[PDB]
Amino acid sequence: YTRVVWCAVGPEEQKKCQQWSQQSGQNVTCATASTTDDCIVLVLKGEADALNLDGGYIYTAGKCGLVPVLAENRKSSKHSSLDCVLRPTEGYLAVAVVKKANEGLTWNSLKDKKSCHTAVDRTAGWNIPMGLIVNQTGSCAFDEFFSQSCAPGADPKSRLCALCAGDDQGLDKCVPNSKEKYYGYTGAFRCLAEDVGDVAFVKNDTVWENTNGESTADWAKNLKREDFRLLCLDGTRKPVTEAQSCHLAVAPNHAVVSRSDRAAHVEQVLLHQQALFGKNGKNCPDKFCLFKSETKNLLFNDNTECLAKLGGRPTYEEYLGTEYVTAIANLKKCSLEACAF
Ligand SMILES: *[C@@H]1O[C@H](CO)[C@@H](O[C@@H]2O[C@H](CO)[C@@H](O[C@@H]3O[C@H](CO)[C@@H](O[C@@H]4O[C@H](CO)[C@@H](O[C@H]5O[C@H](CO)[C@@H](O[C@@H]6O[C@H](CO)[C@@H](O)[C@H](O)[C@@H]6O)[C@H](O)[C@@H]5O)[C@H](O)[C@@H]4O)[C@H](O)[C@@H]3O)[C@H](O)[C@H]2NC(C)=O)[C@H](O)[C@H]1NC(C)=O
Ligand SMILES: *[C@@H]1O[C@H](CO)[C@@H](O[C@@H]2O[C@H](CO)[C@@H](O[C@@H]3O[C@H](CO[C@@H]4O[C@H](CO)[C@@H](O)[C@H](O)[C@@H]4O)[C@@H](O[C@H]4O[C@H](CO)[C@@H](O)[C@H](O)[C@@H]4O)[C@H](O)[C@@H]3O)[C@H](O)[C@H]2NC(C)=O)[C@H](O)[C@H]1NC(C)=O
Protein backbone atom coordinates (compact mmCIF):
# COMPACT_ATOMS: atom_id res chain seq x y z
CA TYR A 1 0.00 0.00 0.00
CA THR A 2 1.97 2.73 1.64
CA ARG A 3 4.60 3.90 -0.87
CA VAL A 4 4.01 7.18 -2.76
CA VAL A 5 5.64 8.15 -6.10
CA TRP A 6 6.22 11.91 -6.21
CA CYS A 7 6.45 13.57 -9.63
CA ALA A 8 9.39 15.97 -10.03
CA VAL A 9 9.47 18.66 -12.72
CA GLY A 10 12.99 18.95 -14.17
CA PRO A 11 16.47 17.94 -12.92
CA GLU A 12 16.66 20.17 -9.82
CA GLU A 13 13.34 18.95 -8.42
CA GLN A 14 14.54 15.40 -9.23
CA LYS A 15 17.64 15.88 -7.08
CA LYS A 16 15.64 17.22 -4.10
CA CYS A 17 13.18 14.34 -4.47
CA GLN A 18 16.03 11.79 -4.47
CA GLN A 19 17.24 13.21 -1.15
CA TRP A 20 13.68 13.07 0.23
CA SER A 21 13.34 9.52 -1.10
CA GLN A 22 16.61 8.42 0.60
CA GLN A 23 15.76 10.03 4.00
CA SER A 24 12.23 8.59 4.04
CA GLY A 25 13.48 5.00 3.70
CA GLN A 26 11.80 4.64 0.30
CA ASN A 27 8.40 5.57 1.71
CA VAL A 28 8.46 8.15 -1.10
CA THR A 29 10.10 7.56 -4.48
CA CYS A 30 10.41 9.78 -7.54
CA ALA A 31 9.26 9.89 -11.13
CA THR A 32 10.58 12.79 -13.22
CA ALA A 33 9.12 14.66 -16.21
CA SER A 34 10.18 17.76 -18.15
CA THR A 35 6.94 19.71 -17.68
CA THR A 36 4.10 19.95 -15.16
CA ASP A 37 1.70 18.71 -17.86
CA ASP A 38 3.77 15.56 -18.40
CA CYS A 39 3.71 15.02 -14.65
CA ILE A 40 -0.12 15.28 -14.72
CA VAL A 41 -0.13 12.59 -17.43
CA LEU A 42 2.06 10.24 -15.34
CA VAL A 43 -0.39 10.63 -12.45
CA LEU A 44 -3.35 9.84 -14.76
CA LYS A 45 -1.57 6.69 -15.96
CA GLY A 46 -0.89 5.58 -12.38
CA GLU A 47 2.90 5.81 -12.83
CA ALA A 48 3.22 8.60 -10.25
CA ASP A 49 0.86 9.44 -7.36
CA ALA A 50 1.09 13.16 -6.57
CA LEU A 51 2.76 16.56 -6.98
CA ASN A 52 2.19 20.10 -5.66
CA LEU A 53 0.49 22.35 -8.24
CA ASP A 54 -0.22 26.01 -8.81
CA GLY A 55 -3.92 26.97 -9.07
CA GLY A 56 -3.80 27.18 -12.88
CA TYR A 57 -2.64 23.55 -13.19
CA ILE A 58 -5.16 22.41 -10.57
CA TYR A 59 -7.72 23.59 -13.11
CA THR A 60 -6.11 21.46 -15.87
CA ALA A 61 -5.69 18.44 -13.59
CA GLY A 62 -9.21 18.75 -12.18
CA LYS A 63 -10.92 18.44 -15.56
CA CYS A 64 -9.01 15.14 -15.91
CA GLY A 65 -10.42 13.91 -12.58
CA LEU A 66 -7.52 14.69 -10.22
CA VAL A 67 -8.35 16.09 -6.79
CA PRO A 68 -6.74 18.45 -4.29
CA VAL A 69 -5.51 16.58 -1.23
CA LEU A 70 -3.64 19.08 0.98
CA ALA A 71 -2.80 22.78 0.55
CA GLU A 72 0.35 24.76 1.25
CA ASN A 73 -0.20 26.91 4.33
CA ARG A 74 2.26 29.71 5.10
CA LYS A 75 2.57 31.70 8.34
CA SER A 76 -0.39 34.02 8.99
CA SER A 77 -1.35 36.63 11.58
CA LYS A 78 -4.98 35.58 12.25
CA HIS A 79 -6.49 32.16 13.12
CA SER A 80 -3.43 31.87 15.37
CA SER A 81 -4.83 29.55 18.07
CA LEU A 82 -5.35 26.67 15.60
CA ASP A 83 -2.60 24.26 14.53
CA CYS A 84 -1.09 24.81 11.05
CA VAL A 85 -2.53 21.57 9.65
CA LEU A 86 -6.11 22.50 10.63
CA ARG A 87 -5.93 26.21 9.75
CA PRO A 88 -7.88 27.63 6.79
CA THR A 89 -5.66 28.77 3.91
CA GLU A 90 -5.59 32.49 3.12
CA GLY A 91 -4.47 32.66 -0.50
CA TYR A 92 -1.71 34.78 -1.93
CA LEU A 93 -1.73 38.16 -3.60
CA ALA A 94 -1.01 38.30 -7.33
CA VAL A 95 0.94 41.54 -8.01
CA ALA A 96 2.54 43.36 -10.96
CA VAL A 97 5.95 44.73 -10.05
CA VAL A 98 8.15 47.39 -11.72
CA LYS A 99 11.35 49.33 -10.92
CA LYS A 100 10.85 52.65 -9.13
CA ALA A 101 13.39 54.13 -11.57
CA ASN A 102 11.04 53.27 -14.45
CA GLU A 103 8.82 56.34 -13.87
CA GLY A 104 5.49 56.90 -15.49
CA LEU A 105 5.02 53.19 -16.18
CA THR A 106 1.55 52.32 -14.83
CA TRP A 107 -1.09 49.66 -15.58
CA ASN A 108 -2.46 51.79 -18.46
CA SER A 109 0.92 52.06 -20.19
CA LEU A 110 1.86 48.37 -20.21
CA LYS A 111 1.26 47.97 -23.94
CA ASP A 112 4.46 47.41 -25.96
CA LYS A 113 6.54 46.97 -22.81
CA LYS A 114 8.65 43.89 -21.86
CA SER A 115 7.07 41.34 -19.50
CA CYS A 116 8.24 38.60 -17.06
CA HIS A 117 5.79 35.77 -16.29
CA THR A 118 6.25 32.71 -14.06
CA ALA A 119 5.09 30.30 -16.81
CA VAL A 120 2.12 29.99 -19.15
CA ASP A 121 -1.04 28.70 -17.42
CA ARG A 122 -0.01 29.74 -13.90
CA THR A 123 -2.18 31.97 -11.68
CA ALA A 124 -0.14 35.06 -10.82
CA GLY A 125 2.19 34.81 -13.84
CA TRP A 126 -0.36 34.29 -16.59
CA ASN A 127 -4.05 33.57 -15.86
CA ILE A 128 -4.76 36.69 -13.78
CA PRO A 129 -2.76 39.34 -15.72
CA MET A 130 -3.62 38.01 -19.18
CA GLY A 131 -7.28 37.50 -18.25
CA LEU A 132 -7.44 41.15 -17.24
CA ILE A 133 -5.63 42.31 -20.39
CA VAL A 134 -7.95 40.30 -22.66
CA ASN A 135 -11.04 41.67 -20.87
CA GLN A 136 -9.62 45.20 -21.10
CA THR A 137 -8.53 45.14 -24.76
CA GLY A 138 -11.49 43.04 -25.95
CA SER A 139 -9.02 41.02 -28.03
CA CYS A 140 -7.58 37.50 -27.75
CA ALA A 141 -4.27 38.65 -29.23
CA PHE A 142 -2.51 38.52 -25.82
CA ASP A 143 0.52 37.31 -27.79
CA GLU A 144 0.79 40.82 -29.24
CA PHE A 145 0.22 43.03 -26.17
CA PHE A 146 3.81 43.07 -24.89
CA SER A 147 6.69 43.73 -27.31
CA GLN A 148 8.78 40.94 -25.78
CA SER A 149 8.34 38.51 -22.87
CA CYS A 150 9.66 35.55 -21.01
CA ALA A 151 6.64 33.28 -20.52
CA PRO A 152 7.99 29.75 -20.05
CA GLY A 153 5.92 27.18 -21.95
CA ALA A 154 5.06 29.36 -24.98
CA ASP A 155 6.57 28.82 -28.48
CA PRO A 156 10.37 29.31 -28.21
CA LYS A 157 10.40 31.01 -31.65
CA SER A 158 7.80 33.57 -30.56
CA ARG A 159 8.05 36.95 -28.86
CA LEU A 160 6.59 35.40 -25.70
CA CYS A 161 9.96 33.59 -25.35
CA ALA A 162 12.36 36.27 -26.69
CA LEU A 163 13.51 37.30 -23.23
CA CYS A 164 13.98 33.83 -21.70
CA ALA A 165 17.57 32.72 -21.27
CA GLY A 166 17.61 28.94 -20.88
CA ASP A 167 20.17 27.16 -18.74
CA ASP A 168 23.89 27.79 -18.09
CA GLN A 169 24.56 26.86 -21.72
CA GLY A 170 21.64 28.60 -23.40
CA LEU A 171 19.92 25.25 -23.74
CA ASP A 172 16.25 24.62 -22.85
CA LYS A 173 15.26 28.22 -23.56
CA CYS A 174 11.72 28.83 -22.40
CA VAL A 175 11.10 25.33 -20.95
CA PRO A 176 8.61 25.50 -18.06
CA ASN A 177 10.89 24.03 -15.41
CA SER A 178 13.64 25.49 -13.25
CA LYS A 179 16.29 24.86 -15.91
CA GLU A 180 15.06 28.05 -17.53
CA LYS A 181 16.79 30.95 -15.72
CA TYR A 182 13.63 33.14 -15.61
CA TYR A 183 11.09 30.40 -14.69
CA GLY A 184 8.79 30.52 -11.68
CA TYR A 185 8.23 33.20 -9.07
CA THR A 186 11.95 33.64 -8.38
CA GLY A 187 12.90 33.60 -12.08
CA ALA A 188 10.27 36.14 -13.20
CA PHE A 189 11.37 38.45 -10.40
CA ARG A 190 15.04 38.02 -11.45
CA CYS A 191 13.99 38.91 -15.02
CA LEU A 192 12.76 42.23 -13.62
CA ALA A 193 15.66 42.79 -11.21
CA GLU A 194 18.18 42.38 -14.06
CA ASP A 195 16.20 44.79 -16.22
CA VAL A 196 15.44 42.22 -18.90
CA GLY A 197 11.73 43.05 -18.61
CA ASP A 198 9.83 46.16 -17.48
CA VAL A 199 7.20 44.29 -15.46
CA ALA A 200 7.05 41.05 -13.46
CA PHE A 201 3.82 39.19 -12.65
CA VAL A 202 4.49 37.35 -9.40
CA LYS A 203 3.00 37.24 -5.88
CA ASN A 204 3.54 39.63 -2.97
CA ASP A 205 5.79 37.20 -1.10
CA THR A 206 8.36 37.01 -3.93
CA VAL A 207 9.34 40.68 -3.59
CA TRP A 208 9.96 40.42 0.19
CA GLU A 209 11.81 37.10 0.02
CA ASN A 210 14.30 38.36 -2.57
CA THR A 211 15.10 41.87 -1.23
CA ASN A 212 16.88 43.52 1.72
CA GLY A 213 19.22 40.56 2.28
CA GLU A 214 16.48 37.91 2.59
CA SER A 215 18.15 36.12 -0.33
CA THR A 216 21.91 35.65 -0.44
CA ALA A 217 21.87 34.72 -4.14
CA ASP A 218 24.30 36.80 -6.22
CA TRP A 219 21.57 38.53 -8.25
CA ALA A 220 19.44 39.39 -5.18
CA LYS A 221 22.20 40.44 -2.72
CA ASN A 222 21.83 44.18 -3.25
CA LEU A 223 18.11 44.50 -4.11
CA LYS A 224 16.24 46.96 -1.87
CA ARG A 225 12.42 46.97 -1.46
CA GLU A 226 12.32 50.75 -1.99
CA ASP A 227 13.59 50.23 -5.54
CA PHE A 228 10.34 48.53 -6.54
CA ARG A 229 6.71 49.57 -7.08
CA LEU A 230 3.43 47.66 -7.43
CA LEU A 231 1.06 48.53 -10.28
CA CYS A 232 -2.54 48.93 -9.08
CA LEU A 233 -5.56 48.55 -11.31
CA ASP A 234 -6.57 52.20 -10.83
CA GLY A 235 -3.43 53.55 -12.56
CA THR A 236 -1.54 54.30 -9.35
CA ARG A 237 1.87 53.00 -8.25
CA LYS A 238 2.47 52.05 -4.60
CA PRO A 239 5.23 50.81 -2.29
CA VAL A 240 5.51 47.04 -1.89
CA THR A 241 4.26 47.51 1.67
CA GLU A 242 0.83 48.33 0.20
CA ALA A 243 -0.02 44.99 -1.43
CA GLN A 244 -3.31 44.58 0.46
CA SER A 245 -4.64 47.63 -1.41
CA CYS A 246 -2.77 47.22 -4.72
CA HIS A 247 -2.96 43.64 -6.05
CA LEU A 248 -4.49 42.08 -9.17
CA ALA A 249 -6.35 39.29 -7.33
CA VAL A 250 -6.09 36.83 -4.49
CA ALA A 251 -4.99 33.39 -5.66
CA PRO A 252 -5.80 30.00 -4.13
CA ASN A 253 -2.78 28.35 -2.53
CA HIS A 254 -0.69 25.72 -4.33
CA ALA A 255 -1.99 22.27 -3.40
CA VAL A 256 -0.98 18.63 -3.60
CA VAL A 257 -3.13 16.74 -6.11
CA SER A 258 -3.53 13.06 -6.89
CA ARG A 259 -5.90 10.64 -8.59
CA SER A 260 -9.20 10.40 -6.71
CA ASP A 261 -8.70 6.70 -5.99
CA ARG A 262 -5.29 7.40 -4.39
CA ALA A 263 -6.19 10.50 -2.39
CA ALA A 264 -6.60 9.02 1.09
CA HIS A 265 -3.34 7.10 0.87
CA VAL A 266 -1.40 10.14 -0.42
CA GLU A 267 -2.84 12.24 2.44
CA GLN A 268 -1.84 9.74 5.16
CA VAL A 269 1.74 9.41 3.90
CA LEU A 270 2.25 13.16 3.49
CA LEU A 271 0.97 14.05 7.00
CA HIS A 272 3.59 11.62 8.44
CA GLN A 273 6.34 12.86 6.09
CA GLN A 274 5.80 16.41 7.33
CA ALA A 275 5.95 15.44 11.04
CA LEU A 276 9.45 14.21 10.10
CA PHE A 277 10.67 16.80 7.56
CA GLY A 278 8.38 19.85 7.87
CA LYS A 279 8.95 23.14 9.69
CA ASN A 280 9.08 21.62 13.18
CA GLY A 281 9.82 18.08 12.11
CA LYS A 282 11.75 15.40 13.98
CA ASN A 283 14.42 15.50 11.29
CA CYS A 284 14.35 18.87 9.53
CA PRO A 285 17.17 21.07 10.55
CA ASP A 286 19.24 17.93 11.17
CA LYS A 287 18.81 15.43 8.32
CA PHE A 288 16.42 16.92 5.74
CA CYS A 289 13.89 19.76 5.31
CA LEU A 290 10.99 19.30 2.85
CA PHE A 291 10.19 23.01 2.65
CA LYS A 292 13.76 24.26 2.03
CA SER A 293 15.88 24.69 -1.13
CA GLU A 294 17.56 28.15 -1.05
CA THR A 295 14.80 30.35 -2.54
CA LYS A 296 14.32 28.00 -5.49
CA ASN A 297 10.85 26.74 -4.53
CA LEU A 298 11.57 23.12 -5.47
CA LEU A 299 8.62 20.68 -4.96
CA PHE A 300 7.00 23.11 -2.51
CA ASN A 301 7.28 26.87 -1.95
CA ASP A 302 10.06 27.69 0.57
CA ASN A 303 7.75 29.88 2.63
CA THR A 304 5.50 26.87 3.45
CA GLU A 305 4.84 26.33 7.16
CA CYS A 306 2.87 23.13 6.59
CA LEU A 307 0.56 21.20 4.32
CA ALA A 308 -3.00 21.72 5.59
CA LYS A 309 -6.14 19.55 5.46
CA LEU A 310 -8.87 21.01 3.31
CA GLY A 311 -12.16 20.60 5.19
CA GLY A 312 -15.40 20.58 3.25
CA ARG A 313 -13.74 17.86 1.17
CA PRO A 314 -13.87 20.27 -1.79
CA THR A 315 -13.84 19.47 -5.48
CA TYR A 316 -11.24 21.27 -7.61
CA GLU A 317 -13.90 23.88 -8.52
CA GLU A 318 -14.80 24.55 -4.90
CA TYR A 319 -11.10 24.61 -4.01
CA LEU A 320 -10.29 27.18 -6.71
CA GLY A 321 -13.58 29.13 -6.18
CA THR A 322 -16.22 30.38 -8.67
CA GLU A 323 -14.43 33.74 -9.20
CA TYR A 324 -11.17 32.11 -10.28
CA VAL A 325 -12.56 29.30 -12.45
CA THR A 326 -14.69 31.67 -14.53
CA ALA A 327 -11.65 33.85 -15.19
CA ILE A 328 -9.69 30.81 -16.47
CA ALA A 329 -12.58 29.63 -18.68
CA ASN A 330 -13.05 33.05 -20.27
CA LEU A 331 -9.31 33.26 -21.03
CA LYS A 332 -9.26 29.62 -22.21
CA LYS A 333 -11.80 30.69 -24.86
CA CYS A 334 -9.00 32.55 -26.64
CA SER A 335 -6.57 29.66 -27.13
CA LEU A 336 -14.62 22.61 -24.99
CA GLU A 337 -15.30 20.82 -21.69
CA ALA A 338 -13.00 17.79 -21.41
CA CYS A 339 -9.51 16.63 -20.35
CA ALA A 340 -6.74 18.18 -22.49
CA PHE A 341 -5.07 14.75 -22.67
C1 LIG B 1 3.59 40.05 1.63
O1 LIG B 1 4.63 39.10 1.80
C2 LIG B 1 5.44 39.15 2.96
C3 LIG B 1 6.39 37.97 2.92
O2 LIG B 1 5.64 36.78 3.05
C4 LIG B 1 4.62 39.16 4.26
O3 LIG B 1 5.46 39.57 5.32
C5 LIG B 1 5.62 38.53 6.31
O4 LIG B 1 4.63 38.62 7.30
C6 LIG B 1 4.65 37.56 8.23
C7 LIG B 1 3.47 37.68 9.19
O5 LIG B 1 2.29 38.01 8.48
C8 LIG B 1 5.96 37.62 9.02
O6 LIG B 1 6.02 36.52 9.89
C9 LIG B 1 6.15 36.96 11.26
O7 LIG B 1 7.50 37.01 11.65
C10 LIG B 1 7.65 37.30 13.02
C11 LIG B 1 9.07 37.79 13.29
O8 LIG B 1 9.73 38.08 12.07
C12 LIG B 1 7.33 36.02 13.80
O9 LIG B 1 7.41 36.25 15.21
C13 LIG B 1 6.19 36.26 15.99
O10 LIG B 1 5.13 35.39 15.61
C14 LIG B 1 4.06 35.40 16.54
C15 LIG B 1 3.08 34.25 16.30
O11 LIG B 1 2.44 34.35 15.05
C16 LIG B 1 3.44 36.80 16.49
O12 LIG B 1 2.20 36.90 17.16
C17 LIG B 1 1.13 37.07 16.21
O13 LIG B 1 -0.17 36.92 16.76
C18 LIG B 1 -0.52 37.90 17.72
C19 LIG B 1 -1.89 37.56 18.31
O14 LIG B 1 -1.75 37.00 19.60
C20 LIG B 1 -0.51 39.30 17.12
O15 LIG B 1 0.25 40.17 17.94
C21 LIG B 1 -0.49 41.38 18.21
O16 LIG B 1 0.17 42.52 17.70
C22 LIG B 1 -0.53 43.72 17.93
C23 LIG B 1 0.10 44.86 17.12
O17 LIG B 1 1.09 45.53 17.90
C24 LIG B 1 -0.57 43.98 19.44
O18 LIG B 1 -1.20 45.21 19.72
C25 LIG B 1 -1.31 42.84 20.13
O19 LIG B 1 -1.23 42.99 21.54
C26 LIG B 1 -0.73 41.48 19.72
O20 LIG B 1 0.46 41.23 20.43
C27 LIG B 1 0.06 39.33 15.70
O21 LIG B 1 -0.93 38.93 14.77
C28 LIG B 1 1.30 38.45 15.56
O22 LIG B 1 1.61 38.28 14.19
C29 LIG B 1 4.47 37.75 17.08
O23 LIG B 1 3.98 39.07 17.14
C30 LIG B 1 5.73 37.70 16.22
O24 LIG B 1 5.49 38.35 14.99
C31 LIG B 1 6.02 35.37 13.34
O25 LIG B 1 6.28 34.01 13.01
C32 LIG B 1 5.29 36.07 12.17
O26 LIG B 1 4.62 35.08 11.38
C33 LIG B 1 7.16 37.61 8.08
O27 LIG B 1 8.32 37.90 8.83
C34 LIG B 1 7.01 38.60 6.93
N1 LIG B 1 8.04 38.34 5.93
C35 LIG B 1 9.09 39.14 5.71
C36 LIG B 1 10.18 38.60 4.83
O28 LIG B 1 9.20 40.28 6.17
C37 LIG B 1 3.47 40.16 4.15
O29 LIG B 1 2.58 40.02 5.25
C38 LIG B 1 2.68 40.00 2.85
N2 LIG B 1 1.68 41.06 2.81
C39 LIG B 1 0.39 40.87 2.54
C40 LIG B 1 -0.39 42.11 2.23
O30 LIG B 1 -0.16 39.76 2.53
C1 LIG C 1 -13.29 38.91 -17.75
O1 LIG C 1 -14.63 39.22 -18.08
C2 LIG C 1 -15.52 38.14 -17.87
C3 LIG C 1 -16.89 38.47 -18.47
O2 LIG C 1 -17.43 39.57 -17.77
C4 LIG C 1 -15.58 37.86 -16.38
O3 LIG C 1 -16.51 36.83 -16.16
C5 LIG C 1 -17.60 37.21 -15.29
O4 LIG C 1 -17.22 37.19 -13.93
C6 LIG C 1 -18.20 37.66 -13.04
C7 LIG C 1 -17.60 37.71 -11.64
O5 LIG C 1 -16.83 36.55 -11.39
C8 LIG C 1 -19.47 36.80 -13.07
O6 LIG C 1 -20.49 37.54 -12.42
C9 LIG C 1 -21.57 36.80 -11.82
O7 LIG C 1 -21.88 37.26 -10.53
C10 LIG C 1 -23.15 36.83 -10.06
C11 LIG C 1 -23.33 37.37 -8.64
O8 LIG C 1 -22.40 36.79 -7.76
C12 LIG C 1 -23.10 36.35 -6.58
O9 LIG C 1 -22.37 37.04 -5.59
C13 LIG C 1 -23.00 37.04 -4.33
C14 LIG C 1 -22.26 37.97 -3.37
O10 LIG C 1 -23.20 38.61 -2.52
C15 LIG C 1 -23.06 35.61 -3.81
O11 LIG C 1 -23.66 35.57 -2.53
C16 LIG C 1 -23.86 34.75 -4.78
O12 LIG C 1 -23.83 33.40 -4.37
C17 LIG C 1 -23.31 34.89 -6.20
O13 LIG C 1 -22.09 34.19 -6.34
C18 LIG C 1 -23.30 35.30 -10.08
O14 LIG C 1 -24.66 34.94 -9.87
C19 LIG C 1 -25.48 34.91 -11.05
O15 LIG C 1 -26.19 33.69 -11.24
C20 LIG C 1 -27.31 33.51 -10.40
C21 LIG C 1 -27.87 32.10 -10.56
O16 LIG C 1 -27.90 31.47 -9.29
C22 LIG C 1 -28.35 34.58 -10.72
O17 LIG C 1 -29.54 34.39 -9.99
C23 LIG C 1 -27.74 35.94 -10.40
O18 LIG C 1 -28.65 36.95 -10.76
C24 LIG C 1 -26.41 36.12 -11.14
O19 LIG C 1 -26.66 36.41 -12.50
C25 LIG C 1 -22.70 34.64 -11.33
O20 LIG C 1 -22.49 33.26 -11.07
C26 LIG C 1 -21.38 35.28 -11.73
O21 LIG C 1 -20.39 34.98 -10.78
C27 LIG C 1 -19.90 36.43 -14.50
O22 LIG C 1 -20.61 35.21 -14.43
C28 LIG C 1 -18.77 36.24 -15.51
N1 LIG C 1 -19.31 36.37 -16.86
C29 LIG C 1 -19.22 35.45 -17.82
C30 LIG C 1 -19.62 35.88 -19.20
O23 LIG C 1 -18.83 34.29 -17.64
C31 LIG C 1 -14.19 37.45 -15.91
O24 LIG C 1 -14.18 37.24 -14.52
C32 LIG C 1 -13.16 38.51 -16.29
N2 LIG C 1 -11.80 38.04 -16.03
C33 LIG C 1 -11.03 38.61 -15.12
C34 LIG C 1 -9.64 38.09 -14.95
O25 LIG C 1 -11.42 39.55 -14.42
Ligand SMILES: *[C@@H]1O[C@H](CO)[C@@H](O[C@@H]2O[C@H](CO)[C@@H](O)[C@H](O)[C@H]2NC(C)=O)[C@H](O)[C@H]1NC(C)=O
Ligand atom coordinates in the same frame (compact mmCIF):
# COMPACT_ATOMS: atom_id res chain seq x y z
C1 LIG D 1 7.80 4.46 6.41
O1 LIG D 1 6.43 4.17 6.57
C2 LIG D 1 6.13 3.30 7.64
C3 LIG D 1 4.63 3.02 7.60
O2 LIG D 1 3.92 4.21 7.88
C4 LIG D 1 6.56 3.91 8.98
O3 LIG D 1 6.51 2.94 10.00
C5 LIG D 1 5.62 3.32 11.07
O4 LIG D 1 6.07 4.47 11.78
C6 LIG D 1 5.24 4.87 12.85
C7 LIG D 1 5.67 6.21 13.43
O5 LIG D 1 7.02 6.50 13.13
C8 LIG D 1 5.25 3.76 13.90
O6 LIG D 1 4.53 4.13 15.06
C9 LIG D 1 4.66 2.50 13.28
O7 LIG D 1 4.71 1.44 14.21
C10 LIG D 1 5.43 2.13 12.01
N1 LIG D 1 4.82 0.97 11.36
C11 LIG D 1 3.84 0.97 10.46
C12 LIG D 1 2.66 1.88 10.67
O8 LIG D 1 3.88 0.23 9.47
C13 LIG D 1 7.98 4.49 8.91
O9 LIG D 1 8.15 5.35 10.01
C14 LIG D 1 8.25 5.27 7.62
N2 LIG D 1 9.65 5.64 7.53
C15 LIG D 1 10.05 6.90 7.33
C16 LIG D 1 11.46 7.23 7.75
O10 LIG D 1 9.35 7.77 6.81
Ligand SMILES: OC[C@H]1O[C@@H](O[C@H]2[C@H](O)[C@@H](O)[C@H](O)O[C@@H]2CO)[C@H](O)[C@@H](O)[C@@H]1O
Ligand atom coordinates in the same frame (compact mmCIF):
# COMPACT_ATOMS: atom_id res chain seq x y z
O1 LIG E 1 -22.86 32.15 -7.85
C1 LIG E 1 -23.21 30.89 -7.27
C2 LIG E 1 -21.97 30.02 -7.15
O2 LIG E 1 -21.52 30.03 -5.80
C3 LIG E 1 -20.25 29.39 -5.72
O3 LIG E 1 -19.52 29.83 -4.57
C4 LIG E 1 -18.28 30.41 -4.96
C5 LIG E 1 -18.41 31.94 -4.96
O4 LIG E 1 -19.24 32.36 -6.05
C6 LIG E 1 -17.05 32.62 -5.07
O5 LIG E 1 -17.22 34.03 -4.88
C7 LIG E 1 -16.10 32.06 -4.02
O6 LIG E 1 -14.81 32.67 -4.17
O7 LIG E 1 -15.96 30.65 -4.23
C8 LIG E 1 -17.16 29.90 -4.05
C9 LIG E 1 -16.83 28.44 -4.34
O8 LIG E 1 -15.93 27.94 -3.34
C10 LIG E 1 -20.40 27.89 -5.95
O9 LIG E 1 -19.10 27.29 -5.99
C11 LIG E 1 -21.11 27.62 -7.28
O10 LIG E 1 -21.65 26.29 -7.26
C12 LIG E 1 -22.25 28.59 -7.60
O11 LIG E 1 -22.46 28.58 -9.01
Ligand SMILES: [Fe+3]
Ligand atom coordinates in the same frame (compact mmCIF):
# COMPACT_ATOMS: atom_id res chain seq x y z
FE1 LIG F 1 1.07 30.29 -8.02
Ligand SMILES: [Zn+2]
Ligand atom coordinates in the same frame (compact mmCIF):
# COMPACT_ATOMS: atom_id res chain seq x y z
ZN1 LIG G 1 -8.56 42.25 -3.42
Ligand SMILES: [Zn+2]
Ligand atom coordinates in the same frame (compact mmCIF):
# COMPACT_ATOMS: atom_id res chain seq x y z
ZN1 LIG H 1 -18.44 20.42 -1.69
